[PDB]
Design a protein around this motif. Structure first.
Motif, PDB file in Angstrom:
ATOM      1  N   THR A   1      46.313 -11.482  35.493  1.00  0.00           N
ATOM      2  CA  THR A   1      47.784 -11.144  35.865  1.00  0.00           C
ATOM      3  C   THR A   1      48.352 -12.633  36.154  1.00  0.00           C
ATOM      4  OG1 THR A   1      46.504 -10.637  38.045  1.00  0.00           O
ATOM      5  CG2 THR A   1      47.051  -8.848  36.635  1.00  0.00           C
ATOM      6  N   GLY A   2      47.583 -13.618  36.575  1.00  0.00           N
ATOM      7  CA  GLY A   2      48.031 -14.941  36.873  1.00  0.00           C
ATOM      8  C   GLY A   2      47.040 -15.740  37.208  1.00  0.00           C
ATOM      9  N   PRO A   3      47.754 -16.964  37.784  1.00  0.00           N
ATOM     10  CA  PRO A   3      46.643 -18.222  38.252  1.00  0.00           C
ATOM     11  C   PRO A   3      45.628 -17.491  39.365  1.00  0.00           C
ATOM     12  CG  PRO A   3      48.999 -18.839  38.394  1.00  0.00           C
ATOM     13  CD  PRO A   3      49.047 -17.365  38.116  1.00  0.00           C
ATOM     14  N   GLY A   4      44.382 -17.980  39.080  1.00  0.00           N
ATOM     15  CA  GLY A   4      43.316 -17.650  40.246  1.00  0.00           C
ATOM     16  C   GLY A   4      42.145 -16.234  39.535  1.00  0.00           C
ATOM     17  N   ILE A   5      42.689 -15.880  38.346  1.00  0.00           N
ATOM     18  CA  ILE A   5      41.935 -14.906  37.864  1.00  0.00           C
ATOM     19  C   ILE A   5      40.720 -15.401  37.274  1.00  0.00           C
ATOM     20  CG2 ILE A   5      41.592 -13.314  35.727  1.00  0.00           C
ATOM     21  CD1 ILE A   5      43.125 -11.962  37.955  1.00  0.00           C
ATOM     22  N   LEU A   6      39.561 -14.876  37.564  1.00  0.00           N
ATOM     23  CA  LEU A   6      38.209 -15.249  37.198  1.00  0.00           C
ATOM     24  C   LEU A   6      37.688 -14.165  36.196  1.00  0.00           C
ATOM     25  CD1 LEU A   6      35.626 -17.336  37.669  1.00  0.00           C
ATOM     26  CD2 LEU A   6      34.999 -15.619  39.387  1.00  0.00           C
ATOM     27  N   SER A   7      37.338 -14.601  35.015  1.00  0.00           N
ATOM     28  CA  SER A   7      37.085 -13.867  33.761  1.00  0.00           C
ATOM     29  C   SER A   7      35.938 -14.587  32.961  1.00  0.00           C
ATOM     30  CB  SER A   7      38.315 -13.816  33.181  1.00  0.00           C
ATOM     31  OG  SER A   7      38.201 -13.064  31.785  1.00  0.00           O
TER      32      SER A   7
ATOM     33  N   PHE B   1      36.142 -18.516  32.944  1.00  0.00           N
ATOM     34  CA  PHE B   1      37.202 -19.376  33.089  1.00  0.00           C
ATOM     35  C   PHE B   1      37.940 -18.938  34.328  1.00  0.00           C
ATOM     36  CE2 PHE B   1      40.291 -16.649  31.346  1.00  0.00           C
ATOM     37  CZ  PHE B   1      39.610 -15.766  30.406  1.00  0.00           C
ATOM     38  N   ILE B   2      38.687 -19.954  34.839  1.00  0.00           N
ATOM     39  CA  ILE B   2      39.717 -19.568  36.003  1.00  0.00           C
ATOM     40  C   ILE B   2      40.912 -19.754  35.255  1.00  0.00           C
ATOM     41  CG2 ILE B   2      40.417 -20.558  38.269  1.00  0.00           C
ATOM     42  CD1 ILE B   2      37.742 -21.985  38.740  1.00  0.00           C
ATOM     43  N   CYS B   3      41.916 -18.772  35.569  1.00  0.00           N
ATOM     44  CA  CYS B   3      42.992 -18.870  34.776  1.00  0.00           C
ATOM     45  C   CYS B   3      43.943 -19.834  35.754  1.00  0.00           C
ATOM     46  CB  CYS B   3      43.939 -17.430  34.918  1.00  0.00           C
ATOM     47  SG  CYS B   3      42.763 -16.350  33.681  1.00  0.00           S
ATOM     48  N   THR B   4      44.886 -20.397  35.216  1.00  0.00           N
ATOM     49  CA  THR B   4      46.053 -21.238  35.761  1.00  0.00           C
ATOM     50  C   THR B   4      47.225 -20.955  35.634  1.00  0.00           C
ATOM     51  OG1 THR B   4      45.910 -23.182  34.413  1.00  0.00           O
ATOM     52  CG2 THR B   4      44.437 -23.282  36.466  1.00  0.00           C
TER      53      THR B   4
END
Length: 165
Positions: free
Chosen positions: A93-99, A113-116
């Protein structure tokens, strides 16, 4: 039973940068959360301590967790083999998501990965299992060492990691 929190202490060419902490959504993806948690504590005898973030692309993500080959080709889960995509309940959904990073269906290992940025095209393909809770600023600082092709301009490492109460 509260969702676990784990921390990474990040360094840059060996110099401390700061701490990032993550909430792991064990309530929604327990198997995937548990993998990341136990790799962060090192309690199985292997895990993230000392590993690097090998692929940082500003405006996209910071990828790490390849503790065996340090380049995106390695890593292993705590389950003796790569494991299945647990569910896709949670979205990017946006920055900070851990996947979870992966190389095809049902090939989760240790890389994550950490989304930015919002990465909705990954929905239904990569299992989301946590979010940054503190230190998003530290992820943004990490991001600045990245580049378009993902190569980092300083060595970005997990100098320590573990679980917080």
């Amino acid at each position: 039973m509260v969702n676990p929190t784990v921390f990474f202490d990040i360094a840059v060419d060996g110099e401390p940068l700061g701490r990032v902490s993550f909430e792991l959504f064990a309530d929604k993806v327990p198997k995937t959360a548990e993998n990341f948690r136990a790799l962060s504590t090192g309690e199985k005898g292997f895990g993230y301590k000392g590993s690097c973030f090998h692929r940082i692309i500003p405006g996209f993500m910071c990828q790490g967790g390849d503790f065996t080959r340090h380049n995106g080709t390695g890593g292993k889960s705590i389950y003796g083999e790569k494991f299945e995509d647990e569910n896709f309940i949670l979205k990017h959904t946006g920055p900070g998501i851990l996947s979870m990073a992966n190389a095809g269906p049902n090939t989760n290992g240790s890389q994550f990965f950490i989304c930015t940025a919002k990465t909705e095209w990954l929905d239904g393909k990569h299992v989301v299992f946590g979010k940054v809770k503190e230190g998003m600023n530290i992820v943004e600082a990490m991001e600045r060492f990245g580049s378009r092709n993902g190569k980092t301009s300083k060595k970005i490492t997990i100098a320590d990691c573990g679980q917080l109460e």
